[PDB]
Each structure stands twice: as C-alpha cells, then as structure tokens.
Amino acid sequence: PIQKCKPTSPGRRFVEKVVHDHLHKGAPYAPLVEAKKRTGGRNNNGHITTRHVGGGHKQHYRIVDFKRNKDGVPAVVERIEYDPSRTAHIALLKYADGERRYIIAPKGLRAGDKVQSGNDAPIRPGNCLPLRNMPIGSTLHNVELKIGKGAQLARSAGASVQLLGRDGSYAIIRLRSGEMRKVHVECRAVIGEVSNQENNLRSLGKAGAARWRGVRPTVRGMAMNPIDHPHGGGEGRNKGIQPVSPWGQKAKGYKTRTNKRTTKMIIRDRRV
C-alpha cells in the first residue's frame, strides 16, 4: 500500500511511497533487456524540441511482448518485476515449450497463474482475445488499433476500457478519457485491468526526486523578458495578456485537433 516517512529531515516530511511485497528482488531476465541511452530532448539537428528533459538514472529497456502471437500454447507466470520505463509492472511468462517472454501484468496476477492467447482462450485475466470473442461489458486493456500492430490503448498503470458492444463489423468501447470510440472486431485485447493502480497516490516530497526521473525545472513565462516569452516584461508582477505558449498558442480552452482522417471512428467526444 502506501507508507509515510518520519519527518527527520525537511526533505523527508512529505515522502509517500507505494510499496508492494510480491515484486521480484533481483536482476531482470538478460536475454530480454537492451540498452537505452538518454536524449536530453534533442533531435536530428541537435536542437531542443522538448523542454524540461535531462538527466536521471541510467535505465535499460525491457523488450515487452505487445502483440501476443503465440496462440494455443499456454504459459505460467514466473514472477512480477519492476519496470523503469513504464508505470505498470511486468510479468515474466514461461511458455510450455520453454520460451520466455515479458507482458504487461494484470491486476490480480501473481506467480503461478496460467495465461493463453488466440480466439480459443478461456476468459481469464491475462488472456488475449479478438474483440469478436469477448462478452459484452468486459473490462479490457492492451487494445489494438491496427490489425497485427500490437497494443496501443490502455497500457498505463491502472487503465482499462469497457466493451460497450459490437455492431456491424465494429466494436464500440469507452476509453479512460471518457471518449467513445469504435474499433475493428479483428483487433485484440486482454481481459482485466492494468497492475499497479496505486501509482497516483505517491508523493515525491522533494525537488531532487523529480530530477532522479529526468525532469528539468520549468521557468514561468511571466518571469522572463519580452524577448523570450509573450508573457515577459513589466515592473513588478503583472500578466496583462491572455495566456499563451512560448510560441503564441492559446493555453486555456483553445482546441488543437486537426485530423480529418479519423473523425469517423470517434463516436462521442469526451466533453459531450
């Protein structure tokens, strides 16, 4: 659950950590790990294209199986591990033929559980099925958009979608946004909810804990000169302007979606 530290220093007074007992204490599975270098938020040209990025702890990349294309063969959960790159926990599966893989861990999953894939799998948490073969009302995660591409939606620590129902050749689902979308019935999804689910009750407590995760400080535009930001300037504090970004785009309520290729898949908008 959630542990609170004693206030022995000013920096520890507001540290609240999420502690799980079942997590693995050891090294990751080496054939499934690779090297990830940092970028500083810079691109091809060497320019900063994302502000407030830089530093942090050295991190590997766990190669996670998002497609789940071993149908029929059943597996057994070996252990649940901490993953530094995502907010969810991962699970090490050992298939019946000997192979080892990583997957996004569902909520109730522990070491020893059975998972399967294909349009023949039993309806159990951790099983990957096409949306064609899933009862209406199900709670799902790791949902595909394109056919064969892999899971794209509802992947973070405690996400889930709801299959509202199939009609014609399209399933209608409801996202964690509130949006109502349609998806092709030949796409796959996993039964259940994502693992961690208590992530958002964590409190960092101190500024260096944000720098550990590779986040650099934010300078308010109000605090600059007129040559750096549209908010710069003034004698004393003043913001006599409608709020905008460093490049002049409105910041409170102005909508920025401009994609006419996909508006037909959107059934209901999140603000309706």
Interactions with RNA, residue window 87-116 (CB under 7 A): 87-88, 94, 96-100
Using CB under 5 A as the binding rule, the residues of this chain from 35 to 54 that contact Mg ion are 52
Please select the residue that binds RNA; options are 54, 84, 118, 125, rule is CB under 7 A: 84
Which alpha helices (DSSP H) does 106-231 contain, by range? 207-211
| Burial readout 164-184 (b: 16 or more C-beta within 10 A, e: otherwise) | bebeeebbbbbbeeebbbbbb
Binding pattern for the stretch 38-57 against RNA, x by CB under 7 A and - elsewhere: -x-xxxxxxxxxxxxx--xx
Q: Which amino acid is at 38?
A: R
Q: How far apart are CA 177 and CA 269, in angstroms?
A: 9
Q: How many residues does the chain have?
A: 272
Question: Using the rule CB under 5 A, is 239 a contact of Mg ion?
Answer: no
Which stretch, 124-132, 164-172, 184-192, 216-224, contacts RNA (CB under 7 A)? 216-224
Name the DSSP letter for residue 222. G
| Residues 116 and 93 sit within 8 Å (Cβ to Cβ) | no
7: its two tokens = 């206030």
CA atoms 102, 100, 65, 32: torsion sign: positive
Using CB under 7 A as the binding rule, the residues of this chain from 223 to 262 that contact RNA are 223, 229, 231, 237-239, 242-247, 249-259, 261-262
Give the residue closest to Mg ion by C-beta. Answer: 236
Which stretch, 124-132, 164-172, 184-192, 264-272, contacts RNA (CB under 7 A)? 264-272
C-beta of 135 vs 240, nearer to Mg ion:
240
Question: Using the rule CB under 5 A, is 236 a contact of Mg ion?
Answer: yes
Q: Which does 59 bind (CB under 5 to 8 A by kind): RNA, Mg ion, none?
A: RNA
